[PDB]
Amino acid sequence: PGAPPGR
Amino acid sequence: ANEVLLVVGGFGSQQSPIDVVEKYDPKTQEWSFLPSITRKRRYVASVSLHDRIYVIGGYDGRSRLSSVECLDYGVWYSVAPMNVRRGLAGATTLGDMIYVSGGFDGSRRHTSMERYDPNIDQWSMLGDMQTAREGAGLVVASGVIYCLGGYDGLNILNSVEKYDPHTGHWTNVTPMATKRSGAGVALLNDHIYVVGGFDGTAHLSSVEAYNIRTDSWTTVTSMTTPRCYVGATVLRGRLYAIAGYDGNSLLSSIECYDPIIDSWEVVTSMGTQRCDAGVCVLRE
């Protein structure tokens, strides 16, 4: 989305 | 009278959606654990309505969820699902109904907003926003719904929209100074506060305040640390920023905004590090 961490 | 803070789900330590539910009592300044939600949910929202905690939408690591579940302030149970799968949607209360707008369903961002009526247990579609937004904030100000910021799949947004019930459409208002996604949104006195977020390149600690009376934006003393996908709420008249991502690590911090001396200080920390978790305030 923006700077949200990913998994 | 006492007001409690509730933090539900989110993205955890172990780089995974979590089901943890924590309660902060400021009177005791103490944290407590509640029964965990039935499904691990990141990108989730949460609201308080008639001493009920509603956990709305989210993403479980596999799908983004139509499902909504409820706890009476305890046991967690599901209620009527939304018409749209919504991850990173804005949620608020108006009258005695729940309003949820925007979000991402795994393939397209949403202009839709919908309304939950508890007396009939129903989700009803309403008017669409001009721009689809995920990670946008929802707040109520003078009986009117505002949705702020977000991300449309292309650019981070400084756009702010306000809903007109008499027409079923949204009208634009003065945009924010900084485009923000995953910012926390709350109403404190006569100002809508937007805290933190992400502007496309940097994780923000900046805070903006929109004056309800003058319809003008101001910059406020920034938070103690950058926070994106941070919760924002008001407890007993004080603005609180809850957890989030500081650009490098998840955050435990809960910090408070002191209006009289105009400063931020970290007041407490939870037992878990989370970002994009649902936040709500409940009256005891």
Can you describe this structure?
The complex is a heterodimer of chains A (7) and B (284). Chain A is low in regular secondary structure and 7 residues long. Chain A has no helix or strand. Chain B is mainly β and 284 residues long. Chain B has one domain (1-284): Neuraminidase. Chains A and B meet through loops of A and loops of B. Chain B: It comes from Homo sapiens.
Describe the structure in brief.
The complex is a heterodimer of chains A (7) and B (284). By secondary structure, chain A is largely without helices or strands. Helices cover 0% and strands 0% of the residues of chain A.
Strand-residue proportion of chain A: under 5%
Q: What is the total number of structural domains of chain B?
A: 1
Sheet with most strands: strand arrangement of chain B: 3-2-1-24
Approximate shape of chain B? globular
Supply the CATH class of chain B: Mainly Beta
Helix % of chain B is under 10%
First and last CA, distance of chain B: 6 Å
Q: What is the CA–CA distance across the termini of chain A? A: 13 Å
The name of the CATH architecture of chain B is 6 Propeller
The helicity of chain A comes to under 10%
Give the beta-strand count of chain A.
0
Tally of contiguous helical segments of chain A: 0
Number of helices of chain B: 0
Instruction: State the secondary-structure class of chain A.
Output: little secondary structure
The rounded Rg of chain B comes to: 17 Å
> CATH homologous superfamily of chain B?
Kelch-type beta propeller
Beta-strand fraction estimate of chain B? 35-45%
Tell me the greatest interface: A-B, 6 and 25 residues
PDB class: ligase
Keywords: E3 ligase, klhl-12, Ubiquitination, ligase
Assembly: dimeric
Entry title: Structural Elucidation of Peptide Binding to KLHL-12, a Substrate Specific Adapter Protein in a Cul3-Ring E3 Ligase Complex
